[PDB]
């Protein structure tokens, strides 16, 4: 017997509805809550203000153990590159200066790059992460001394050995095939890519 203190008992089985619509009067309880951490009101008596209810308990007889099949609905606007997912973040060890006067050798560092959030294709991403490597180069690497041939992290998608002739030992079209095979990376001496705190290693 699903005893509700106002109406007659509704014996047997029923349905409780927890809907995302705490927008009428239960919105002084969900001020700091989102559509995923909210406080509904499962009491739908259409004679009490949504707040005058929500102080009335649904009571099923206590001589029995009550089960209930939960069946849920859920939408999402979640994109690709958002930060919550930990996408849009990667670290790269990238040259900051050719011939550091202290050592006469290049000086590499560990910069954390950040792509603009939003839902991108699989290419526009790998071009947005190339537009961050070649966008920190403009501020740390331009005015410290490094040729564009020193950019040492380039997310490429070719199979660079297409044309490679074993006899001659080098590709013999005079160019790379520019046909996408896989997102692979292309590094240089010292430079690297760290995906520990990141999640682009999946995308």
């Amino acid at each position: 017997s699903i005893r509700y203190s106002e109406l007659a008992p509704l014996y047997d089985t029923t349905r409780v509805y927890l809907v995302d619509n705490k927008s009428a009067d239960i919105a002084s309880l969900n001020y700091q809550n989102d559509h995923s951490n909210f406080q509904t009101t499962v009491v739908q008596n259409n004679d009490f203000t949504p707040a005058e209810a929500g102080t009335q308990t649904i009571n099923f007889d206590e001589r029995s153990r009550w089960g209930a099949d939960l069946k849920t609905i859920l939408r999402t606007n979640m994109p690709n590159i958002n930060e919550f997912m930990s996408t849009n973040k990667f670290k790269a060890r990238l040259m900051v200066e050719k011939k550091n006067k202290e050592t006469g050798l290049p000086r590499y560092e560990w910069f954390e790059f950040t792509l603009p959030e939003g839902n991108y294709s699989e290419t526009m991403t790998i071009d947005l992460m190339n537009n961050a490597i070649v966008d920190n180069y403009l501020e740390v690497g331009r005015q410290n001394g490094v040729l564009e041939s020193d950019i040492g992290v380039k997310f490429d998608t070719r199979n660079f050995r297409l044309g490679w002739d074993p006899v001659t030992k080098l590709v013999m079209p005079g160019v790379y095939t520019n046909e996408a095979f896989h997102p692979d990376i292309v590094l240089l001496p010292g430079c690297g890519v760290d995906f520990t705190q990141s999640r682009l290693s999946n995308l």
Binding site: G163, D165, V167, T168, M172, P173
Partner: peptide, 7 residues
Amino acid sequence: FNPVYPY
């Protein structure tokens, strides 16, 4: 030398 590539 036969560089099979057409060129």
